[PDB]
Amino acid sequence: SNLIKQLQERGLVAQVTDEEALAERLAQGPIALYCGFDPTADSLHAGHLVPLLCLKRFQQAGHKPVALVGGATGLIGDPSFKAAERKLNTEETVQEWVDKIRKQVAPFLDFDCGENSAIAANNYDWFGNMNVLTFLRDIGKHFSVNQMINKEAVKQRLNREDQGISFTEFSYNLLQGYDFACLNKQYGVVLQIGGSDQWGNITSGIDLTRRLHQNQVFGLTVPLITKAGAVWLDPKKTSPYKFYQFAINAADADVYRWLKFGTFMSIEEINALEEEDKNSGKAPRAQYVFAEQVTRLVHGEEGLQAAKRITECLFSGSLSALSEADFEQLAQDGVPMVEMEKGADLMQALVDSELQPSRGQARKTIASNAITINGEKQSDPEYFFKEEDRLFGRFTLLRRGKKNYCLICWK
Numbered sequence: 245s246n247l248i249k250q251l252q253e254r255g256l257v258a259q260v261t262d263e264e265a266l267a268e269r270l271a272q273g274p275i276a277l278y279c280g281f282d283p284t285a286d287s288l289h290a291g292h293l294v295p296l297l298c299l300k301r302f303q304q305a306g307h308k309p310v311a312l313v314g315g316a317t318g319l320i321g322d323p324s325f326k327a328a329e330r331k332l333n334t335e336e337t338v339q340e341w342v343d344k345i346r347k348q349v350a351p352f353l354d355f356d357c358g359e360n361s362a363i364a365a366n367n368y369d370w371f372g373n374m375n376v377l378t379f380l381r382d383i384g385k386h387f388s389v390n391q392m393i394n395k396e397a398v399k400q401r402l403n404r405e406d407q408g409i410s411f412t413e414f415s416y417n418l419l420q421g422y423d424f425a426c427l428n429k430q431y432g433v434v435l436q437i438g439g440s441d442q443w444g445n446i447t448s449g450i451d452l453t454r455r456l457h458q459n460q461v462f463g464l465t466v467p468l469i470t471k472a473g474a475v476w477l478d479p480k481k482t483s484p485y486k487f488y489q490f491a492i493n494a495a496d497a498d499v500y501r502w503l504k505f506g507t508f509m510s511i512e513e514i515n516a517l518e519e520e521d522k523n524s525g526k527a528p529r530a531q532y533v534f535a536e537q538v539t540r541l542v543h544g545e546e547g548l549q550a551a552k553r554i555t556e557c558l559f560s561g562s563l564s565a566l567s568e569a570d571f572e573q574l575a576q577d578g579v580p581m582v583e584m585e586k587g588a589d590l591m592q593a594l595v596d597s598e599l600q601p602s603r604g605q606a607r608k609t610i611a612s613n614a615i616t617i618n619g620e621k622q623s624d625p626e627y628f629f630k631e632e633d634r635l636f637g638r639f640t641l642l643r644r645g646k647k648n649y650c651l652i653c654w655k
């Protein structure tokens with residue numbers, strides 16, 4: 245059980261500072277480590293899973309994860325590797341996002357396992373009331389503009405005026421540096437993990453911790469899954485169905501690394517899967533394993549089963565199993581959707597959903613037996629929907645041909 249050796253085996257270590265010294269330190273016993281997540285939206289996306297779960301593997305190994313939420317950094321904006329200057333967000337909108345993100349972080353870590361039990365942190369606790377002169381004096385002298393401009397993230401923003409960077413976003417690096425120090429002092433954190441794009445910010449904090457506290461602390465970055473639309477963790481931004489679908493459609497190139505980064509599946513099992521797939525008459529079920537594991541992680545069993553149930557209905561044509569909550573996911577993102585007043589005929593439903601272009605055309609297509617209503621074929625061009633077709637009084641699913649869906653949301 246050399247944690248760093250395993251993480252490397254999983255393809256999880258993008259880079260790491262002073263590796264041998266870190267391996268020894270962990271092997272000596274539990275440490276505290278952190279990773280921080282900024283409130284730049286009301287939810288995390290599938291990308292953040294990598295560092296997040298990585299803290300869970302650290303906690304499974306006896307270590308103590310701190311999950312920092314950027315109450316303060318969210319008011320500022322990480323320019324790291326972004327070509328465009330972010331608009332600032334509202335102080336009231338940011339706190340909204342903070343509590344939300346704190347909340348969705350929490351289920352992935354054990355807050356009640358004794359000593360290595362997890363801790364939520366918010367860097368607003370230290371920046372929220374810090375005087376500007378105090379900041380400039382105690383933290384800002386230890387930073388050199390030269391060294392700052394030369395860091396890889398902000399380097400491209402600085403050549404010359406394709407885009408610029410505000411002094412605000414430039415400041416950002418210092419705040420993440422001080423977070424590290426402040427957490428080293430407060431909780432004895434000695435490792436920070438983060439995505440590969442965060443190296444610079446991590447290293448400034450290592451360096452600053454030397455100068456402030458005379459401790460040695462480590463850096464470790466995990467690789468990105470560049471999915472920022474993004475695949476949101478929030479079921480209301482991205483439905484478990486859609487989430488499951490993203491997963492089950494991971495390319496072959498990616499699926500094995502995503503198995504590694506995104507799931508607690510055994511390294512043994514992940515290899516066995518790969519070696520099987522390559523042999524097995526081109527029978528690749530890794531996506532399917534991938535999908536089920538991560539959906540279950542993120543959305544629980546009930547989310548998994550829903551997404552599978554919704555997947556199975558759109559494949560089969562039979563809607564018998566759908567619940568109302570299942571139509572809501574279809575409505576939110578699962579299939580195209582149209583709102584309609586009750587009393588419209590089929591012909592019209594087909595026009596208003598874009599399945600047919602004219603009433604006259606709809607008529608001929610209905611008559612060629614091309615249209616199903618809730619799975620059951622309907623070929624009477626003059627058909628009016630009846631209450632039975634308004635499932636849960638609200639929902640009707642059209643299909644044209646074998647795979648063109650549109651969901652009718654009745655008002």
Ligand SMILES: N[C@@H](Cc1ccc(O)cc1)C(=O)O
Pocket residue numbers: 279280281282312314317322367419420421423424438442445
């Ligand atoms: N800079 C990180 C978030 C973060 C904020 C504060 C920290 O101390 C650490 C990390 C990001 O934008 O992804």
